[PDB]
Amino acid sequence: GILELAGTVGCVGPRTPIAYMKYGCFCGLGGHGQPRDAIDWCCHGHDCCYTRAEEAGCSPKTERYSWQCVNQSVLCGPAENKCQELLCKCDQEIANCLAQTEYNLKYLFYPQFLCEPDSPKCD
Numbered sequence: 443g444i445l446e447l448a449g450t451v452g453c454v455g456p457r458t459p460i461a462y463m464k465y466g467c468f469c470g471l472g473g474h475g476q477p478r479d480a481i482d483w484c485c486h487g488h489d490c491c492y493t494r495a496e497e498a499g500c501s502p503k504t505e506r507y508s509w510q511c512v513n514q515s516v517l518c519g520p521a522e523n524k525c526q527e528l529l530c531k532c533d534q535e536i537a538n539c540l541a542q543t544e545y546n547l548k549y550l551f552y553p554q555f556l557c558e559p560d561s562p563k564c565d
């Protein structure tokens with residue numbers, strides 16, 4: 443869920459999860475257009491992951507799951523079901539993705555009217 447998403451991102455990366463709350467075209471609720479940079483690609487890929495999780499019959503924004511932060515790395519588990527494993531995998535992936543990125547301040551609160559109607563495909 444959102445609590446774990448924030449935690450995992452904070453665990454691995456060098457910056458507050460708030461840094462991604464409305465950034466580029468994809469970091470934040472929803473998202474569309476051409477991803478603006480590496481961080482925006484991470485969020486695009488995460489949005490895709492959550493959509494897949496929803497299609498599998500999970501609730502990616504709400505379901506709690508256990509994880510550990512060890513040496514600024516996310517370890518997923520113990521998982522009680524498949525949704526908890528999918529969710530944790532999604533969040534672990536974006537945490538790892540964002541941790542390797544440099545922040546472009548100019549994309550924080552980027553104007554949504556510049557984000558194109560269509561988006562790159564998932565997978």
Ligand SMILES: NC(=O)c1ccc(Cc2ccccc2)cc1
Pocket residue numbers: 444447448451459460462463468469470471472473484485486488489536
């Ligand atoms: N995929 C996304 O759009 C996306 C959006 C935000 C974050 C980081 C965050 C997590 C919880 C609360 C605020 C920020 C990660 C991914």
Ligand SMILES: [Ca+2]
Pocket residue numbers: 468469470471472473485489
């Ligand atoms: Ca998004």
